Nucleic acid binder design. Sequence first.
RNA 1: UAAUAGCUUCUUAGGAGAAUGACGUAGCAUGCUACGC
RNA 2: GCGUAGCAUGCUACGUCAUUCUCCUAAGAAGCUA
Lengths: 590, 590, 396, 186
Amino acid sequence: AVGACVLCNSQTSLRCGACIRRPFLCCKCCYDHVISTSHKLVLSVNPYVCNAPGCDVTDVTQLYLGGMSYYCKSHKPPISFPLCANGQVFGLYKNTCVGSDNVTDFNAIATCDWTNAGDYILANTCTERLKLFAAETLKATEETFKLSYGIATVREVLSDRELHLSWEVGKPRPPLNRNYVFTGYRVTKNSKVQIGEYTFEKGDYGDAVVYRGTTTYKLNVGDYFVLTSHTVMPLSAPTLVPQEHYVRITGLYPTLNISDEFSSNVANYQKVGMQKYSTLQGPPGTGKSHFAIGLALYYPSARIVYTACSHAAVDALCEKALKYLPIDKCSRIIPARARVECFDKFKVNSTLEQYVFCTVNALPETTADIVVFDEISMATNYDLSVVNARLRAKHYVYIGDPAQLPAPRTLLTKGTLEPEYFNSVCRLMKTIGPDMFLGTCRRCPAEIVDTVSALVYDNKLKAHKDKSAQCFKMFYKGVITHDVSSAINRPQIGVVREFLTRNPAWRKAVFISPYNSQNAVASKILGLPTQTVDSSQGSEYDYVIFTQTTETAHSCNVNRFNVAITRAKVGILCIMSDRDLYDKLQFTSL
Amino acid sequence: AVGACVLCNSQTSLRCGACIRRPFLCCKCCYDHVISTSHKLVLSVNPYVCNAPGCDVTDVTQLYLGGMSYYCKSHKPPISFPLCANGQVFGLYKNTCVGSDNVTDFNAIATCDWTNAGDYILANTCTERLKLFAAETLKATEETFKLSYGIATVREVLSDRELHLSWEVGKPRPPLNRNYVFTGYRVTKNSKVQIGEYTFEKGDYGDAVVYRGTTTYKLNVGDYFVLTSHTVMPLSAPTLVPQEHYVRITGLYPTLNISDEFSSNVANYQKVGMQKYSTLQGPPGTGKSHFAIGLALYYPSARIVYTACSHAAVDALCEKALKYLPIDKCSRIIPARARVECFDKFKVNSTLEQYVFCTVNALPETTADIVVFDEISMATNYDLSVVNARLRAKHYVYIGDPAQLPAPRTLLTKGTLEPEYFNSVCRLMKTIGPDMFLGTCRRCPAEIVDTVSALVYDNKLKAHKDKSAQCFKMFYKGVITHDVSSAINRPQIGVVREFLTRNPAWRKAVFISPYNSQNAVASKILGLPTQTVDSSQGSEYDYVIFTQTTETAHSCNVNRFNVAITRAKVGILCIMSDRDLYDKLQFTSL
Amino acid sequence: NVIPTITQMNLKYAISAKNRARTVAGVSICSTMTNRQFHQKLLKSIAATRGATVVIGTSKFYGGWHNMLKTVYSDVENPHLMGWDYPKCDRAMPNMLRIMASLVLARKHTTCCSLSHRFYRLANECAQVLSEMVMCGGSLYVKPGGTSSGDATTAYANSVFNICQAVTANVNALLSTDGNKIADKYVRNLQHRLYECLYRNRDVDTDFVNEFYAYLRKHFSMMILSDDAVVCFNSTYASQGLVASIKNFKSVLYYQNNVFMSEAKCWTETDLTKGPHEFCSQHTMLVKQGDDYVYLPYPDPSRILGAGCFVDDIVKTDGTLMIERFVSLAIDAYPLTKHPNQEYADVFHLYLQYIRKLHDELTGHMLDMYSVMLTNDNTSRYWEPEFYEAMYTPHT
Amino acid sequence: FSSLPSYAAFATAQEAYEQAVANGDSEVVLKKLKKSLNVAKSEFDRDAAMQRKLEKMADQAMTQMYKQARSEDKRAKVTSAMQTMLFTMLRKLDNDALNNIINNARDGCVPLNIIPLTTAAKLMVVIPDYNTYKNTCDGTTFTYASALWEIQQVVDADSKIVQLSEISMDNSPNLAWPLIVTALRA
RNA sequence: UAAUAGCUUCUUAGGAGAAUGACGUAGCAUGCUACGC
RNA sequence: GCGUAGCAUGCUACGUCAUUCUCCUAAGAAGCUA
Ligand SMILES: Nc1ncnc2c1ncn2[C@@H]1O[C@H](COP(=O)(O)OP(=O)(O)O)[C@@H](O)[C@H]1O
Ligand SMILES: Nc1ncnc2c1ncn2[C@@H]1O[C@H](COP(=O)(O)OP(=O)(O)O)[C@@H](O)[C@H]1O
Ligand SMILES: [Mg+2]
Ligand SMILES: [Mg+2]
Ligand SMILES: [Zn+2]
Ligand SMILES: [Zn+2]
Ligand SMILES: [Zn+2]
Ligand SMILES: [Zn+2]
Ligand SMILES: [Zn+2]
Ligand SMILES: [Zn+2]
C-alpha cells in the first residue's frame, strides 16, 4: 500500500515498522528517521528482513538487496547493493520525495514514552499532520498500557445493588467512576466467553463495590474481571477546520419570537452564526448549557448536533433541551452496547432527526447545519479530529471553560500540564481569547465570586445575590495517615465534627475531597452524601463540605480549587492547609 | 490522429498541449514553436509525459524516447534517444515536414490573450490558414473567459415573479440582460443535477431580478445557477469559398418581367449570377436588404437561405419577405431555447422549405442555390466559417456595410478596430471594393441625413424628404448612476418623461440608448418600446427618442450615434452629453 | 465442501459454414482455478505424449501428421479407415458418461487424495460443470446435463467419452455376433470370456481386461482428438462382426446417447494411400517430399479464402497492418500446392502474391510517412515458398 | 561509473602518461606508466559492467515491487466491490417469506430452486408468441407457482411499453415478440 | 459480453550456454642479449 | 653452469568488448483446430 509521508506529504511506500502506529515515510524522510533514532526496521510492500533459509536481520542500515530479496552481508550475492544509501531508503517513488527537516521534532514525537510533561506540550504545537500523528500514537500507547493490568472477581453474591471485590495480589487497581468500565470472563470450565460489562466503585467499608450493570445475566464466582480494551483506528480530519468568515449568516435563518428569556445573547447568537467555528468560554455557572438552547431557538429550523466527551454533560444538555426546546423533534443517539445507564426520555436514536444529541465516541457519519461541541476541556485532540471527520456542518461552536478540570490524561505523572495545552481549542482560547465570554455568576457569595474572578479570570464575573454569610475557610492541621494508595484526613473530620454542631444548616451536606480515599472514609462514620471533585462540575448544591488533606502542587492547583469552591451556593465548611490557600480569598475566621 | 500542420499543411502527428485549441503541428514547425515560446507540452498519439512509475516531466527538450516509451532524463532506459533535437521534434512523418517562417506571427497569435487591439489587426491580415486558426483560438478564449465568472444562488422569494439574487463572495458578477443564460444545481445531498435553463434581468427597486425560465421549477433556497459553457468546434470550412468567375449564369434562371419595382437592380442580379460570391456594400437604407428579396423574385426557382448574426435583423428581413415573397413558401428557424421572441407568422421550423430564414448560430446543415448573408458587420469570422460549413450553396451573396456598428468584441478594451478588420468580408469590401454598390437616403428626413452626412460620411449623401422640423437636440446634464455595470441616467429619463406628455404625437417613439441597463429600466417610467443601439440597426421606426446616457468612449462613438439617429423615419428627439456631439449636428432649439 | 457455480453462455463470433449460432460456456474462476489444480498434471502429461491413442499436444507440422497416421496404422491386418460423428455431442452426452470420464481422469489420485477427497472433487465437478446454474441473458436457468465446453478438462474428458463409446461399440459387436459362425477359435473363447467378465463376474479380471485391450489395439487401432476419431480397423473381422463397424456405432449412440448418427456424416476409406477422409477438418494427401512419400494435411480452400476475405475486426481489413495474419494463413494453405486440382494449388500462390503486394504498399506508405526506408527488412522470406515448405519437413 | 574514484585513477594515470610521453620520458618509465594506466583502466572497467547489472536489477526489483503492491491496491477495490454486492443482495431479500420457509425446513436447509418460487415478490414471464400469452397469463391476473399474480407491466423485446389491449390475435404481427410481462405477487 | 485446451508464426526484453575474433593482466614453457658469481 | 633484467614466440587461467548461434523464461500481436 502506498500513501503520503507524514512530514512532507509526498507519495511513498515505506513505513517505520518499529513505531506503534507504523506511519508512512518518504525516502529522504525515512532515511532521516532511521539514521537518527533507534528505529531500524522499515516496512515496504514486503518487510525488510533477511530472506535467507537461516538468518534474522531487521536493521535496514545493514541490509543489502540482491537478486529479488534482501540479505545481510553474510548472505548477499556477488552483486551489490545497499538498500539505505545516497541519503534515501530504497522504495517506491524515489524521485518525487521531497525531504523536510521538521524531523528534528518527529524524532521526539515518535520516540517519546509520554511519561514526562513536555511530550504533550510539543505534541500539540507541531504542525497539523504531526498534530494528528502524535494524538494517534498517544492513544495507541494508552491502549497498550491498559493491556498490562490487575484482575479481580466477585467474592460471593453479596447484594442486588452491590457486589464485592477479590483482586489479585501484586498489581495496582484503577480509579472507579463511569469512565473506567470492567469486563467479566466466563472461563468456568468450559469456554471463556462474555456475559456483560460492569463498572465498579468503592464500597462503604472494608472491601465492597457499589456498581453499575450492563447485563442481567447474574454470574456465580465463575467469572473474573479484567479491564477491557480495543484497537485505535487511524484519524484523518484536521483538529480544527480553517477559520473562514462569512459576511451575512448563511444557511441559518433567524426566528420569530425567540423568547424574552435569552434575548441579550442575540448579538452572540449571530456571532456564532457568522464565522465557521466559534469559541465560547463561560466561567462556571454562566449559561453555556443554556446558551446552546438559546442558539437552537435563534435559528429554529436548523438541525443541530450537540456533542460532548462524556455522558454526564450531554445528558444534562439533553434535559435542558427537553425543558426548553420542542420535544418531539429530538433524538439522543445511544451506544448499541450501552456501557452507561443511558438516557431514554426522548424519541431515542433516530439519526435522521433535527436536534440530534450524541457523545463523541458514538457519533455516526452524518451532516448537520451547526454542531455544538460541549466541554472542550474534557475533549482530547482525538475527539476533535473525530468530530471533524464524522460530522460535516456549516458551523461549529465549541463551548466550555479551560479553567475547569482537564481530561483524565492517565499517562502523565511528572510535572503539571498547564491549561493552555489541554487541546487545540483550549490553546486557541488562551492564545487570542474566546470569541464569546459571558461573565456573571448566579451561585456564589460576594467575596468568593469577586476573588475567583480575581483569582485566575481577567476580572469578568459577578453575583446577582448577596453573600449568604455561611461560607468559611479554616486552617486546622488535620493529621495525615495516608496508609493507602491515596491520602486520608480523618481527624480533620474530627475537627469539622467539633464544628457542625453549632452550625445546624449543612446537616444534609455533600462531602467532597481532593482524594478518593478520604472521600470514601467520609461516607462511613457519618452518612454524608458524597460527590467527588471530578463528579462535580455540572451540578449545583446548597450544602457541601470540603476538606484539604495535604499540601503540594496537587493542593494548589487553582483549576481544582475553582471547580471545588463553586459548587456550593449558600454554605461550605472547608479546610485549608497552606497559608497560600487561606490568603487568596476572603472569608470569616472562626 | 494523423493530421495536417496548421501553418504549412504538411503531414504530422503532433499537437501542442498548452494551446487551447490543440493544433496539429509538423516536426519543424513544432520545434520552432516550442523552443521559442513558453509552451512545452506536445501530444503525439501518446502524450509526451515521462513514463516512470511516478514522474511528471513535460518539457520536450528534457525527454527521450527510451525503450518503448517517453522517459525523462534520469528515468530513461539506458539506451536513449533525444526527442526534441536536430532542429526537429520527433513525431510521425518526420522526414517530410517542411514549413515556413510564419513562425513569427504564429507565436504572437498563440501567445496573445486578445486583450490589446493589435492582436486583432494581426489576426486578420495574416495568411489564410492563420486567419482560421486565429478565429478558432479567439472563440476558444472567449469561451474560456466564462470560466472565471461567479455562480449564483437564491436569497428567498417574497414575490414569485421577481427572484432574489445572491452572488458568490469573491468572484465577479455577470451583467443581467437577455444575452446570458444560466443553468442550475441543487447540490445539498440530494441532486447535484441541473434544474432548468433560466435567465435574469434587474429590478428597479431594492435588490431583485424579474427572472424567466424554460420550465416552471421553484428554487428551494439551496438551488442555484451557473452560466453555461460552450465547446468550440474546429473551424472546418474556409472563411470565404474561393471565387470563380463564370462566363455565363450557371445554376440560376431569370424571370419574365420580375416587377416594376425591382427593375433597376437587374444588372447586379446578373453579376451575382456570374460570380461565385458577391458583396453588396451600401449606406443604410439604400436598398440592400430589399435587394435580396428582389433577387429572390428574379431567380424564382432558386432555393434561398437567408441568414444574419442578429435576431432583430432577420426578423425585419422576414417581415419584408412576407410583404413581397409568396408567404406559403417561407420558413423561420429558431433555436431550442429561443431566448428572444422570434417571428411566428410563417410555418416555423421547416428547413426543407424554398425560402428559409435563420440566424447563423442556429443554421442547420443543408444545401441551397444561393445563400444570402446579411449584415456582415455583426458577423465575425466564426459566423462566416459556420455559414460556409453548414450551408452548401452554388452562389453566395454577402450584403452589409462596414460603417454600421460591428460585432460586440467584449474582450477588446484598448484602441479602436477599423472597419477593414471586422471580418474577412468587410476586409474584402474595403480593400478592393464591393462588387455591387448602391447609395442615397430614402427613409430618414432631410435634417437628420443632412447632419449624418457630416458625422460619418464626408458630405456624400444627398437624400429625399423635407425636414419636418421634428428633429430635436436637447441640453440636459444627465447625472450618472452606474448601477448594473451599465450606466443608468435617471434624470435624463426624467427629462423624457416630463416632456413625453407634452408631445401628443410622440407617444409611440422607440426609446434608444447605448446602455442596455437604462434602456431596459425605462420600460416602467414611460412604457415605450425600448431598444438598444446594437440591435436597433437594420430596423426603422416612425419616431425615435435617443438618450446619450453617459459621456464615455462607448456612447460618444460616432458610428454608434450615426446608426442610432438614422433609424428615424419622420422625426427624432435626442438628448446629448458631449458638448461637441450636440454641436456637430444641426437640430432645433429647445 | 461443494461449491456450486454459475456458468455464463457466451455467443461465439467466428467464421463458420452453417448459420446456427455457436455458444461457449464461461465457467467461473472459482471452478477453473481448482479444476486446474486438480487435473493439470495429468492433462499436461497427456499433451506431452507422442504415439498414444489420444493425439492431444501433437503438432501437425514438421511431419507430425505423418507420424500420427503411421501410428494409427499400427500393424493392422486388413486395414480400412473409418470415421464417425457425434450429433449434438456436448449437449446430448449422458450424465453417466460424463461422470465416467471424470472418474477415469481421477484414477491418477490414488496417493494424493483420499476416498472422500475424490468424491468431493467429483461432486464439485458435477455441481460446476455437469448440472449447474447457467446465466443466459441475465437469467439463471438449470442445465439438465451434458458437458459444458468451458471447464478445464473439456477436450480430455471428451476424449475419454469418445474412447468409451468406441469400446462399447466393439463389445456390442463382439457379443451380438452368433458364436457358432465364428471360425477363429481364439475369438470364440474371447467372446465367451467377455460375456463372463460382463455378466457373470463382479470383480475386475485384469488378465482379461489386458487381453481385450490387446485385441482392440491389434484390430481396432484408434486416433482420438476429443470428438474426432480415425480408426484403422481390420476389415475382415469387421465384416465377420468381430470388430465394431459404423452400424455398431449407430446402435450404441441410439441406445446410449439418445441421438441418431446418420451414415452420411461417417466415412470409410478402403485405400490407405489416400489417408483419412477428414480429421480435425483437414483432408490428407500422400506427397513425394524430398525422396520419400509423406502424408500432408490440407484444409478446405473455401475456409482459407473466407478467412482472408472476412474478418472479425475493422482493423484486420487494412492488410498492411496484418501481414502476419496472411503469413499464418499461407502456412496453413501451403499443402494445397501439391493438390492435383490447380484451383486448389492457386490459393497458396494467391496468398503469397498478396503478401508481396502488402509489403510493397506497406513500404510505399512507410516511405511516404517519412523519407527513409527501413534499414532491416526480413519480409522477403514470406513470399518464398521455402519458408512454408520447411514447415512440413520432419527436421524439427 | 564517473562517481566512483576508479575513473579518477584512470584519468590521472592517463594524464601522467600523456604528459611524460610529451616530455620525452625514457622507455622504462614509459613502460611503467603504460602498465599503471593498463591496471587503472582494468579496475575502471571491472567496477563498471557492475553498474549495468546494478541498474538492471534495480529496475527489475522496482517493477516487481510495483506489481506486487498496484496489485495490492487493486485487491482492496475488488474486496470492497464484492462486499457491497453481497450486502445489497442481503438488503434485497424478502425477509419474512424467507424466514417462514426456512423455519418450516426440518434441518434448516431448503433447495435453492424454491427460494424464488416461494418468496420472490415479482415474476417476469417471457413469452415468444401470442398463443403462449393466451395460455399462460391472459387477463390482468393469472396463476403460477400456486400463487396469484397481478400484471403490473408488459414490455416488448425493444423494452417499449405494451398495453394489454394491444396484445391481440390480429395485433400480434405488429408486436416485437418476445413480450416480457412483469407481475407482482398478490 | 467474450470459455477450456493444443499447435504455429512474428516482435521485444532478461538470463544461461556455446562458437569465433579483439584487448588487457597473471601463471608456465622456449630462444636471444646485458651484468654479477 | 647459475642468479637478476630485457625482447621475441607459444600454452593455460581471469576480466572486458564485438559478431553469430542455441536454449530458458517473461511480455505483446496474430492464425488455425476441437
Ligand atoms: N437570561 C437569563 N436570565 C437569568 N438567568 C439565566 C439566564 N440564562 C441562564 N440563566 C441561568 O444561568 C444558569 C446557568 O447554568 P447552566 O444552565 O448549567 O449553564 P452553564 O453551566 O454553562 O452556566 C442557569 O441555572 C440559568 O437559570
Ligand atoms: N426600388 C425602390 N423603390 C422604392 N422604394 C424602395 C426601393 N428599394 C428600396 N426601397 C425602400 O427603401 C428601404 C430600404 O430598406 P433596406 O433595403 O432594408 O435598407 P437596409 O438594407 O439599409 O436595411 C425599404 O424600406 C423600401 O421601402
Ligand atoms: Mg454549560
Ligand atoms: Mg438592410
Ligand atoms: Zn519510527
Ligand atoms: Zn517525507
Ligand atoms: Zn542473514
Ligand atoms: Zn502552443
Ligand atoms: Zn509545419
Ligand atoms: Zn521521469
